[PDB]
Amino acid sequence: QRGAEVLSALGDALVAARTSAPPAPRGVRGMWKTLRAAAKDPDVGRGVSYLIEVARVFGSKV
Amino acid sequence: IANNLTSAIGELKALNAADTPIPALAALKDVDLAGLANSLATLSGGLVKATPALNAVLDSLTDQRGAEVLSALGDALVAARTSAPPAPRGVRGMWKTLRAAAKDPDVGRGVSYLIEVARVFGSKV
Amino acid sequence: IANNLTSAIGELKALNAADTPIPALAALKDVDLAGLANSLATLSGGLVKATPALNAVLDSLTDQRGAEVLSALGDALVAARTSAPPAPRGVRGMWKTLRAAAKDPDVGRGVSYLIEVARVFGSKV
């Protein structure tokens, strides 16, 4: 069931992102501003915790 | 009795049901039907249990935005085999290429979208 | 009458029409045909609606460059189980490995291509 929930959450995240994505970072200063906004966000926080977790559990099996 | 059989046969002809002829099953011999049946049987207990996960994937494809995103990813892979910039030679080349990409407004949209997916996915996990 | 039946069968024998020899269809009871039908029934309304997304995926696979890219990704996953370098021990090891990768010309091509995909996807979103 956790695999089904993860795929639902990825599909919804792609479908939502076509409509909710923030305006494009203009240049290296814009890119650093957007990355420094994302690195404050608690939900981008959960997504990065999960991707570090997948990289650990995959990396425990390879 | 011949007139009775004529009226009986004459009734049968009037009845109409949809009929379509498509006789091309020859490649079934070419198909490894015996092997494929083993593959399907092995996966049937997995497929039946995976039905809720397969439906949740399909539901995300029933949104037109899901179709547009997959089209845009497929085109981006196919184009990139022909449009990709020459390889960054060494750590100074790598930093030059990353500093060129971090000026590009279209790489800008792609990074905005990947930060968005990481937020919306991270809102659900 | 025997000669009439002989000429009739002799015309049946000269049939001259399509004929195929296929004899193997074993392993159907083992298949959970009813179970797959149950999976298909819950999935049919999803599959029919997903047809435009499934076509947009298939269209990106009809380009030979799409086939080449998927072959190159599959081979890279399979090879990496056997060729991957020993694990970076700690933050100093991690920076040494990343600084080795950022000298490699083939990791160079891979990073050029991923920046290209992020540009072409980012030109369509």
B chain contacts of residue C65, beta-carbon cutoff 8 Å: 77-78, 81-82
How many CB atoms sit inside 10 A of residue B74's CB?
21
**How far is C-alpha C111 from the geometric centre of its chain's CA atoms?**
25
Of C125, C65, A12, which is closest to residue B107 (Cα–Cα)? C125
* Deposited resolution, Å: 8.0
A13–B52 CB contact, under 8 Å: no
Please check whether residue A52 touches B, CB under 8 A: no
Q: Tokens 């009845």 correspond to what residue? A: B15
Please check whether residue C13 touches A, CB under 8 A: no
Q: Using CA atoms, how far apart are residues C117 and B75, in angstroms rounded to an integer?
A: 9
B118–A8 CB contact, under 8 Å: no
Do residues C111 and B88 make contact, with C-beta atoms less than 8 angstroms apart? yes
Of C46, A8, C34, C2, which is closest to residue B53 (Cα–Cα)? A8
B chain contacts of residue A26, beta-carbon cutoff 8 Å: 105, 108
CA angle, A47 as apex, A46 and A51 as ends, to 5°? 115
CA distances from A43 to A48, A59, B37, B104, C5 (A): 9, 24, 45, 26, 86
Mark which residues 60-79 of C lie under 8 Å from B by CB: 60-61, 63, 65-66, 68-69
Q: Least CA distance to A59: which residue of chain C? A: C87
Method: cryo-EM
Q: Is the dihedral of CA C77, C83, C87, C92 positive or negative?
A: negative
